[PDB]
Design a protein around this nucleic acid. Structure first.
Ligand SMILES: Nc1nc2c(ncn2[C@@H]2O[C@@H](COP(=O)(O)OP(=O)(O)OP(=O)(O)O)[C@@H](O)[C@H]2O)c(=O)[nH]1
Length: 426
RNA sequence: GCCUGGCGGCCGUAGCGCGGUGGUCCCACCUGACCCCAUGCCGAACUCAGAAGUGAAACGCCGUAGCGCCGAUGGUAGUGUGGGGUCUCCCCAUGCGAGAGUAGGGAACUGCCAGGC
RNA sequence: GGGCGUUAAGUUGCAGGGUAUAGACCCGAAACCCGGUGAUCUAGCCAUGGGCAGGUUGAAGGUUGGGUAACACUAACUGGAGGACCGAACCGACUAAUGUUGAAAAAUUAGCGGAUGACUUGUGGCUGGGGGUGAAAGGCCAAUCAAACCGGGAGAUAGCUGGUUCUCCCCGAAAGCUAUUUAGGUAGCGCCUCGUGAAUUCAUCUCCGGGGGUAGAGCACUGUUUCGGCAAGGGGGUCAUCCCGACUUACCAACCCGAUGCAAACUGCGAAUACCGGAGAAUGUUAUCACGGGAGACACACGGCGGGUGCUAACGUCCGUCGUGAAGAGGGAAACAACCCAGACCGCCAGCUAAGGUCCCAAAGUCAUGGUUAAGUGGGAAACGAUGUGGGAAGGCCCAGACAGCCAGGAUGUUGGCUUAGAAGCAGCCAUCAUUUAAAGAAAGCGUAAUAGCUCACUGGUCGAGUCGGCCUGCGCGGAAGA
RNA sequence: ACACAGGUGGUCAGGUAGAGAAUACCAAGGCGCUUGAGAGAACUCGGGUGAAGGAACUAGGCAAAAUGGUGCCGUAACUUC
RNA sequence: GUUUAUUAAAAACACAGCACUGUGCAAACACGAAAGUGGACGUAUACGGUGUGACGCCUGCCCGGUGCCGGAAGGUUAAU
RNA sequence: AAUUCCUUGUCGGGUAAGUUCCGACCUGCACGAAUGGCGUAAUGAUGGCCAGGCUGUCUCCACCCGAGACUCAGUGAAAUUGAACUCGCUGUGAAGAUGCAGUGUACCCGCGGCAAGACGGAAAGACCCCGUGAACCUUUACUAUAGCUUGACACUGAACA
RNA sequence: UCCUCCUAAAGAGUAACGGAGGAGCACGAAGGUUGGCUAAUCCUGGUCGGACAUCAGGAGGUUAGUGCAAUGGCAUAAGCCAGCUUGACUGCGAGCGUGACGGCGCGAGCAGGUGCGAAAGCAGGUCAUAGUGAUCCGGUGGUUCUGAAUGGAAGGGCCAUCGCUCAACGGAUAAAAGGUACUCCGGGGAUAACAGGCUGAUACCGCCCAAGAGUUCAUAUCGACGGCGGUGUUUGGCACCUCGAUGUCGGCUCAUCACAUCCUGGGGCUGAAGUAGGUCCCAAGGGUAUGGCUGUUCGCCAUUUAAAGUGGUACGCGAGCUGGGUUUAGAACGUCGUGAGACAGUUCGGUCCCUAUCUGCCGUGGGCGCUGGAGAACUGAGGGGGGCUGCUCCUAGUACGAGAGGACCGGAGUGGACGCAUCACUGGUGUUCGGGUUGUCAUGCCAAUGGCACUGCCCGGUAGCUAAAUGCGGAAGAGAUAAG
RNA sequence: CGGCCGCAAGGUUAAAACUCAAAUGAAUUGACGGGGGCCCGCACAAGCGGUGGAGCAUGUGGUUUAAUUCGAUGCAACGCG
RNA sequence: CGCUUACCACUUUGUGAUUCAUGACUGGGGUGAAGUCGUAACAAGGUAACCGUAGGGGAACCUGCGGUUGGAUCACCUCCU
């Protein structure tokens, strides 16, 4: 639907503590989501085992009770934390004078509020069009009351089937424009895969995900705030990590547990950076009672886009209060197996984050020095033109050795097709 | 020919303001009242009897434009009729022609009948 | 006081115009009711007679074929029931094809289903129409069936359609208002005609007496704004100093004070016109009003102006007013109801002319003067873009030489430091003192793998005559893709 | 409505092959169906035969193509035996 | 097995079975303005109606409304 | 699910690919016990699906045989029809032009074919709406009435508490 | 139905399913008269007065009030208090206003009796406009009327009064709900569905500016906030047309046009090392899949290809075909309703007619003309057909490149789809050739033949025709050009 | 799970992986009993006087600032060290 | 020798049976330890227990019927067979 819910709207929240559907939902998570939406909740109903109802997703008497509660509260709309089937919302809508909305609609609504860009607006519109396509079946019958079953001649098919085809034609046109936005990113991606720069995408929960991590690393202005979500479109800036060289970091939007399946598809269409990320990072926050519950959900979103496989260093947030680990630049092993604990909110650790980046960077334990061309002065001018080696030292017999080791590069250019007729060194 | 009281005309060039001025001519206060009347208590109001006292206030007169108020000519908006271009809008001939400003005017004038030179 | 009256001409024929009641101009329903005719088609039932080639399976009756304490267990085979099977006659009708003005108002050809049964068939009979009969379909009851056929009431009724037949002359509408079991019908009124009366009646214009609240303006009022001024009260920086102060704060002040807009439901103003009344010429076949006879119309259309609604869309809708079409031809706008000119009594192988035009189609200027455009503009299109072209008033510079191009000089400190033998702008800064001002930048863009180089402030530039921009304006240009 | 491809109750029932009143061919008997002559286009109808592939056709194996008899063996799930 | 003769042959209808109800015979019920007749020359192991549909397993809870059946303490109640 | 809107629900199968099918899950918009619930051998011109075989259904048609169609002789209709000297395009127009305007093109007549158009023929559209139209059906619409039922009076008498 | 404002264009009047609000009463005082009186707002000093009371003073005719909506009014007050009261009287009413009428409204004054005031005088309801209901039919009271032979009386009339959410408010009647997919009649494109027409809000496409996004870097690539256009092209609006008839999706067959171009050609920019792309310009000559599911356009998928364009053509095409779809009558399920029945639910089943006059095409003739009549061979004004491409190899592993990879030049072969011809080959067919064979009948019979059974069934097959067979081709050039 | 039986409900035959240092039996000594018995104590009863709402003093639940120093916390801390 | 017939390996077709992995969903293990609900059993465990079998709890468990002991206990001052 082109229309989206207005912020500041009065509303009621109906959440069964056990609302079925695997019960991975959290009421504390719901309050953060509703605050961003602009829902004004006078009363939050908490219930025990209301039978999932084919009619209302809540007990038939409870549906009358929530209708009575809504009439008294003055709340303009009804919000339900677990999913309502298209009939299920429609039956609830008949019982109360006020209209109703659902969590799939509410997360879709949240995306609209946090979107300030054209790519985000088209992406949100497509996702709503998919969710509303299922929702519109009840609405189409109400529209056809005026039609009175006319349209038998012209379209051979029964009336209202043609109306679905027109919405589907709008869906087909919508898909073509969305493809163009991705195609433009892919032309940029073709230049981006120069093979000299790795692609990095930062993923996480809406609050746990550290898009703030880019701010400590690049000191670049970005919108990081308490409001749920709020970074819908990705930001890519140049960061030269000393250990890995030039790298590009992309801020993928944060996601929540039980993410609407259409919304993961829409998020991926904008975020193909997640699909192509050579290095990926997941951030976990202690604000939720169980850090583990957020971890499994992030994996499911990654599984949806098939990026779950990449081995990932895990960053941590809320560490500032905990102060459990002070960042330490010590390698117990060359692999250095650990999960980074530094949090970007206070800038706790930077060289230690880089040590984890050295673990990410491919390295040789032997680090055998590459053969070096004879003219150091010409090499130094080339280093000034490109990258000067961080450590360079003289070696015995007039040899020069540098910390960067590239034996394959020296074989490919310095010693490949040379005749060596003189054969001074055999 | 002056100053006062009434009853009108005209109702801001008429009003308000500021400063002055006048007293048994008048007028206003003022003096008394379990008297005629009179307060939903109220001789601040209304009456009645009248002398002292004063123009303080009021009242009237004079100056003062500080504001009110009136306000040209010219220009403009509009519009009647014919004609034209015809973005919803105009333009031309022609007749009528604002409001708002502006220079300015502006502190009234006049009748009738009684009390005082 | 009023209201209705006051001896005011009628009556009967004949002819015509209306209205009422009858079939009431004419044709045309679906239906309803009444009395009959059909069960030779069909549906059920009754009575009495027929048919079912062939082939197969085989029940019961089992005369009976073992054994257990006894039960369980369990032992041979003649017959000929079946709403049995396969399949002709027979009955039906599942798919396809042809036919569909056929051979046929449901058939033909290939395949199909039942065919000893709740079968089929012949001959009679019975049940009759709001009735029958129904293994149930609103099936069937003579190619007719949510109620047969025939005659009657019957020319039912039909605010609905269609048609309405000879000639000429005169006038000539309306598609509005109010009502409606009413919206496509009707009644009254307005508009048309015919007659009879009547006064400078009516119109146009001039002059005069009005009243308003429209346009337009304006913001005092009702609201709606913007800015500047700003402590009343509270935010409150001091504040468990409210401190009868540390201040009223380093915030809005609230009315308020100056300016600025906006209004259909705002008005301290206020037109043009329109309306009403009066007088007066001139004119118009009393054009006006009243009464009586006869209507039609009460579906309007477009354009102009003033608006509502829509999207300042619609050949949209709904109003007010005018014009045209309707109901008006002719000339023009290529063709064209409503747009422009003009209102056709007739004839002429006569002139003038409106709108519109004068190169050919195609009547008339290859007319005159001056100017503009170079696109075929003319001959579809906006925001915007541009040394297209033409005009106008200004500004700077210039014979201490206009504007170009052009080459050289344009350098220490100021390579001094700071991501480091790049330390200097390319990550940033300290910087403007000048030495040696014809001239010299601790520079605008750069570049070199730092360290060279580039253009320009000044000079000499011969050539030199005008030169650089802006504004306003006429006509062009690009923006500019359809089957 | 017709000199109409439909409908119309019973009876008789030869030969050969065949279970048979199926069917093929014949008896006895009756007929060639009241417009013909050419030519041998498309197209239409009713058929015949098809290389290779074989349901790819199509809404759907619609239609067509196949199998088909008698004798002897042999025969599953389930079962109301 | 029957059926929409003449666009529907079906999952429709029927069916044997099962229950519920009425019905004592001059039966109930029907066609009859009535006589009569069918039911039936039958007699509750019979008839009529309604529903379901062989078979196997079964048919839970509820009489609040409406109907039907039984009862009236009182009230209301026509003609007269 | 002859029932589930969403829905092509989710899984597993069968295919290269399966909205059908089959089997599970229960989240029954809107199953449920003679308005019958669940199964069921046999049966079905029943509904849906999957195989083997087979083929002109198909790729993609080809040839052949007969009946027409063609020509010749004889007999000899039909629907329809305001009149026609009956092109195309673009525009206009009661808004889809053989007939108007402009332009291109076009000697005059058949015969055999194809159907793009003559808003082609057939049939006062069947869809929609109106008529202070009609029929039939239903009920808790109004007004009645058959039918059932209740009392009184008559037909209809006597005697004893 | 009534009242008030606006639209309503300064007389009045004026419509819409146009924008805003009220009434279906109240008071015997809130009426009449006489007399008196004058507000809302803040400030100052003061009680449990402080923003809220009540004082003493300071602003105005009034920002107050009006029984209640709105507008017009209002100081002489209509506003507020007191006293006395009942004119909230009866009969009439010159004259107006407003309506088509029925009616509604104002009305000085006359007459008879009241009230208040000394008097002038004023009063026939409320400051005004809403607060209502005709007629019929009945009820009650009075009456100076009539009363069916007469005297009465019932009954009627007149006068006063009563009974209507007759609210659909100019009111059919005392009294009235639904269904029809079983439907039928008379009309209407006066009125919706399909298509065409207007429009273009939406849609789609393009441009204007450019905060941004881009590894630094608005325009390589997209572009927020806003703006302007184009098209008829999607959703809509309208109702001009079509209801005495314009067949509805899809598929099959057959097409044609536009260029907003999918492939193939030519370019520009690139954040284009090569390969491969992105974006834009020019360019319409040709080309632009097969299947599974399902009725599908769609969609999802599997696998092709150089690509499997986007639209118009009545969302092309039913006198061309289909009928899965919808769109009838049978049945069932879920839900709604007491029910008949219903469903923008599902499911199974369910009649698609035309002999071509005209234009139009596709083929093929006749007549006359072209100037004496013939028989030939041609020029070419015009017109049509044809215009596709892949794969491999050389150049060359060269250019390009750190590698991985790997050339828009220039040559050669080889195919796919398409069109044309042909029948030498390979095949098909071949009822008009030969043979085998089942059943029967005939020619006397054996033998040999023939008829009939689909050509009886087959097996083969010549000519001819034909594809699945083989040949051939879409070119190279040349001229004028588009972007460049 | 398979077999067999059963109309079902279920019966019978009857494992495995996985897990633990136990699981159990009878006795002993205590503790405890909303088990029984006998007793005792202002424990109850029979009485007398108080506490539970006004100034001293103590702690905590606890607040506050510079601290409101530390401890004592049912009975057996709370006029306590 | 060629040829033919029997036997037969590879192989192929149909139809079954038994093993292993796996098959959304679903049924049922001991368990780090605190924020985590009731009290069924052990005392007569506050309704004696558990044994079979049905139905209900939808927390252990409750209740019906039969069984078993692997069950605790013998009374308030208080006129009279
Ligand atoms: N974890 C954590 N975050 C903190 C802390 N303090 C402040 N923050 C902020 O909380 C974070 C909020 O979540 P974000 O990291 O913004 O989530 P995000 O995914 O970047 O946000 P979106 O992309 O807008 O959804 C950042 O804004 C941090 O700066 C802290 O102590 N811990």
């Amino acid at each position: 639907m082109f229309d989206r819910y207005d912020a500041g709207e009065q509303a009621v929240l109906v959440h069964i503590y056990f609302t079925q559907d695997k019960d991975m939902e959290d009421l504390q998570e719901f309050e953060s989501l509703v605050s961003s939406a602009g829902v004004e909740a006078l009363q939050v109903i908490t219930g025990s085992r209301k039978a999932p109802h084919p009619k209302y997703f809540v007990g038939e008497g409870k549906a009358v009770e929530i209708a009575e509660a809504v009439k008294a509260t003055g709340a303009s709309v009804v919000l339900f934390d677990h999913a309502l089937s298209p009939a299920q919302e429609r039956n609830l809508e008949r019982l109360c004078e006020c209209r109703v909305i659902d969590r799939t609609g509410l997360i879709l609504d949240i995306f609209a509020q946090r979107a300030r860009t054209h790519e985000g607006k088209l992406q949100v519109e497509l996702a709503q069009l998919r969710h509303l396509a299922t929702r519109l079946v009840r609405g189409w019958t109400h529209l056809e009351r005026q039609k009175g079953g006319i349209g038998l001649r012209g379209p051979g098919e029964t009336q209202l089937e043609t109306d679905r085809r027109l919405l589907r034609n709008r869906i087909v046109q919508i898909q073509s424009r969305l493809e163009r936005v991705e195609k433009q990113r892919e032309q940029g991606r073709q230049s981006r895969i120069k093979a000299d720069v790795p692609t990095v995408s930062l993923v996480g929960y809406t609050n746990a995900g550290k898009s703030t991590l880019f701010n400590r690393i690049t000191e670049a202005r970005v919108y990081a705030a308490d409001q749920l979500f709020a970074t819908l479109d990705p930001t890519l800036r140049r960061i030269d990590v000393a250990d890995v060289g030039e790298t590009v970091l992309a801020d993928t939007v944060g996601f929540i547990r039980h993410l609407p399946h259409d919304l993961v598809a829409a998020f991926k269409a904008t975020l193909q950076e997640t699909r192509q990320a050579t290095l990926l990072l997941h951030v976990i926050d202690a604000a939720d009672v169980r850090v583990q519950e957020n971890i499994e959900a992030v994996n499911t979103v990654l599984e949806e886009i098939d990026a779950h496989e990449i081995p990932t260093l895990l960053v941590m947030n809320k560490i500032d209060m905990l102060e459990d680990f002070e960042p330490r630049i010590d390698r117990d092993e060359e692999n250095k197996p650990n999960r980074v604990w530094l949090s970007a909110q206070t800038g706790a650790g930077i060289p230690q984050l880089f040590q984890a980046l050295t673990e990410r960077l491919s390295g040789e334990v032997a680090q055998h020095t590459l053969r070096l061309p004879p003219q150091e002065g010409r090499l130094r001018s080339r280093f000034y033109q490109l990258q000067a080696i961080e450590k360079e030292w003289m070696e015995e017999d007039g040899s020069v050795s540098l910390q960067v080791r590239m034996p394959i590069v020296d074989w490919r250019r310095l010693c490949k097709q040379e005749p060596a007729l003189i054969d001074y060194l055999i």
